[PDB]
Amino acid sequence: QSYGFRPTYGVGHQPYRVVVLSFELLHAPATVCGPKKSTNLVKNKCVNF
Amino acid sequence: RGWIFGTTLDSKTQSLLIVNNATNVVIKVCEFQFCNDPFLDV
Amino acid sequence: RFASVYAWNRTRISNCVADYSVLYNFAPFFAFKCYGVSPTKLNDLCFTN
Amino acid sequence: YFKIYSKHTPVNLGRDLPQGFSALEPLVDLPIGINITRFQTLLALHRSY
Amino acid sequence: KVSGNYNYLYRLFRKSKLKPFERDISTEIYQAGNKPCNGVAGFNCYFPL
Ligand SMILES: *[C@@H]1O[C@H](CO)[C@@H](O[C@@H]2O[C@H](CO)[C@@H](O)[C@H](O)[C@H]2NC(C)=O)[C@H](O)[C@H]1NC(C)=O
Ligand SMILES: *[C@@H]1O[C@H](CO)[C@@H](O[C@@H]2O[C@H](CO)[C@@H](O)[C@H](O)[C@H]2NC(C)=O)[C@H](O)[C@H]1NC(C)=O
Ligand SMILES: *[C@@H]1O[C@H](CO)[C@@H](O[C@@H]2O[C@H](CO)[C@@H](O)[C@H](O)[C@H]2NC(C)=O)[C@H](O)[C@H]1NC(C)=O
Known part of the structure; x- marks a missing residue:
């Protein structure tokens, strides 16, 4: 049935666009990884490579 | 008379209340909020 | 073009x-x-998918 | 398990930390559980000199 | 509880790790970024419990 929206509607009736993310993180081959944006390089000074 | 420990002072975190008297000591692990040691007595 | 709740819009994320x-x-x-x-x-x- | 290593050496005659070797032994031990990074002491303020 | 056993709590957000055998019982607001919040507990600053 109809689910129309009006701007005059107040809190509790305004349209709320909703997106939900589902994750299946488990012991399986990984396709997506969040990185550390990488840290820049240095020379001639002891570092943990 | 005694010692005070803890961190961040305010009731946000806990603190220590080491103190001696005559033949007694009391310790209290409580969120003690204060500003100075002034333990009025003598 | 956010889809309705009864017909939700699902997207699969690949290696990224x-x-x-x-x-x-x-x-x-x-x-x-x-x-x-x-x-x-x-x-x-890191997520499987 | 708070440690109260202590000893009484009243042999001092005025010099601060006179050169000499002495041992310390704990008296009372008790755990409380707190991230301690602040230290303070209480003084005889009502009658000081 | 048929309705809800909202009597137990546990933390998810901390600035760093935790040593062994101590407690981190405190009611503050997690920064969760450079975005500063003061007890608001809104977006970008979630209640740790
Ligand atoms: C040292 O100070 C503590 C509090 O800092 C006092 O403890 C009292 O001890 C007597 C001993 O019977 C109790 O009856 C009182 O109820 C205690 N008072 C409080 C506030 O806890 C006391 O002045 C000293 N401790 C002693 C004597 O054990
Ligand atoms: C669900 O996914 C998206 C999100 O709305 C919709 O749009 C297209 O999705 C495909 C991937 O399947 C993309 O390649 C296109 O670029 C998206 N846009 C367009 C204009 O096609 C998709 O149509 C939705 N599918 C449904 C509701 O069945
Ligand atoms: C004890 O509490 C103090 C509270 O300030 C901690 O100091 C903070 O530590 C975090 C994590 O390293 C960092 O944000 C800063 O080093 C400090 N922040 C502020 C605002 O002072 C201290 O690290 C705690 N100690 C332990 C062992 O957890």
Whole structure:
């Protein structure tokens, strides 16, 4: 049935666009990884490579 | 008379209340909020 | 063209470098509550899909 | 398990920390559980000199 | 509880790790970024419990 929206509607009736993310993180081959944006390089000074 | 420990002072975190008297000591692990040691007595 | 609730719009994500720190300007973000997996420690985890 | 290593050496005659070797032994031990990074002491303020 | 056993709490967000055998019982607001919040507990600053 109809689910129309009006701007005059107040809190509790305004349209709320909703997106939900589902994750299946488990012991399986990984396709997506969040990185550390990488840290820049240095020379001639002891570092943990 | 005694010692005070803890961190961040305010009731946000806990603190220590080491103190001696005559033949007694009391310790209290409580969120003690204060500003100075002034333990009025003598 | 956000789809209706009865016909929800599902998308599959493939092998990708996902940074969950640039999307903060994509929506007003009225509510960003999250479950057992924390949004703060979310860009250091690798997901199967 | 708070440590109260202590000893009484009243052999001092005025010099601060006179050169000499002495041992310390704990008296009372008790764990409480707190991230301590602040230290303070209480003084006889009502009658000081 | 048929309705909800909202009597137990547990933390998810901390600035760093935790040593062994201590407690981190405190009611503050997690920064969750450079975005500063003062007890607001809104977006970008989630209640640790
Ligand atoms: C040292 O100070 C503590 C508090 O800092 C006091 O403890 C009292 O001890 C007597 C001993 O019977 C109790 O009856 C009182 O109820 C205690 N008072 C409080 C506030 O806890 C006391 O002045 C000293 N401790 C002693 C004597 O054990
Ligand atoms: C669900 O996914 C998206 C999100 O709305 C819809 O749009 C297209 O999705 C495909 C991937 O399947 C993309 O390649 C296109 O670029 C998207 N846009 C367009 C204009 O096609 C998709 O149509 C939705 N599918 C449904 C509702 O069945
Ligand atoms: C004890 O509490 C203090 C509270 O300030 C901690 O100091 C903070 O530590 C975090 C994590 O390293 C960092 O944000 C800063 O080093 C400090 N922040 C502020 C605002 O002072 C201290 O690290 C705690 N100690 C332990 C062992 O957890």
